């Protein structure tokens with residue numbers, strides 16, 4: 001059942017937390033942020049050159065968030081990786097700790113604060129997101145074994161809700177090549193080399209054996225299979241980790257009380273999507289685009305859907321259409337009861353999106369935050 005005394009499950013489209021000792025079971029909401037850096041050359045969450053790590057946690061909690069998605073790369077969850085970019089004068093308790101002991105300390109404290117953590121295997125290397133869950137010198141078996149060691153260790157922390165199996169499965173070539181050419185992810189192709197729907201089942205099963213109490217989060221790909229993608233006019237224009245159009249015909253085969261679908265969705269600050277042109281009816285055209293790419297998974301099919309990344313500069317140094325985009329997206333989440341989400345990012349040092357923090361790592365973008373906090377009321 002559980003090593004921590006806490007057990008997570010999905011009933012209907014809602015995540016519940018069970019306490020086996022008190023017997024309490026309540027629905028939870030994930031009002032989340034992404035705090036990144038363990039996936040980069042820093043090997044640690046960013047901003048610890050400017051801030052104390054507990055204080056960052058306390059500030060996140062104080063803004064109403066109760067969940068952090070923590071991106072990691074393979075090197076950061078191995079014993080002995082040295083972090084760069086910590087002011088030890090501000091973080092004395094982190095002196096001489098390796099990146100793993102820091103991740104342990106951060107998650108423990110999060111727990112004490114009542115913050116859920118979702119572990120995200122964000123990159124295999126520490127430089128960029130790979131299209132597949134393996135590379136030339138890192139196999140799916142190494143990927144799975146990395147998740148098993150992570151689940152073995154982090155399964156002991158009550159507030160770790162689960163595993164976001166791989167960030168942003170995607171493509172590096174164009175369709176039609178992308179479907180068969182083995183360089184990118186697919187879904188419903190019937191090809192184990194590339195089918196993210198099949199890979200998710202294999203990786204999720206491995207993790208549930210060691211952490212049966214966890215949820216498994218599964219993202220979209222970019223392209224799926226040609227019949228799915230051509231069946232919608234914007235079928236070729238989903239984000240990385242954003243195409244869930246294949247779930248209806250090819251659902252992922254994990255237990256229904258364990259599985260959470262986790263699409264990503266972005267604004268004009270990340271990529272100038274063609275449906276962002278007002279001549280295409282932006283922004284009033286978006287709800288139908290969101291619905292087709294991922295929203296029907298919940299609205300029509302009844303699955304838990306947690307948006308795992310979304311954000312943008314909200315007009316601070318970026319495309320002024322980002323303000324309209326983020327407003328419209330949060331309107332649609334609220335009206336369709338997409339209440340669980342993780343914003344990208346808490347960090348201001350996201351080059352195309354900024355974050356909830358400003359560049360001083362201390363003050364927030366009030367307007368951006370005010371729009372988002374509508375989901376938290």
Ligand SMILES: OC[C@H]1O[C@@H](O[C@H]2[C@H](O)[C@@H](O)[C@H](O[C@H]3[C@H](O)[C@@H](O)[C@H](O[C@H]4[C@H](O)[C@@H](O)[C@H](O)O[C@@H]4CO)O[C@@H]3CO)O[C@@H]2CO)[C@H](O)[C@@H](O)[C@@H]1O
Pocket residue numbers: 036037039040071167168237238239240241242264266270271309344349350351352353
């Ligand atoms: O991790 C530290 C790093 O994060 C960067 O922020 C990234 C996230 O890490 C990532 O999860 C996500 O990635 C974007 C990616 O940056 C875009 O390049 C990619 O663009 C695609 C689009 O999805 C397609 O529809 C279109 O056809 O192709 C374009 C590119 O050709 O979209 C994905 C999301 O789907 O988002 C975050 C924002 O980019 C920070 O920017 C960086 O500073 C941090 O170091």
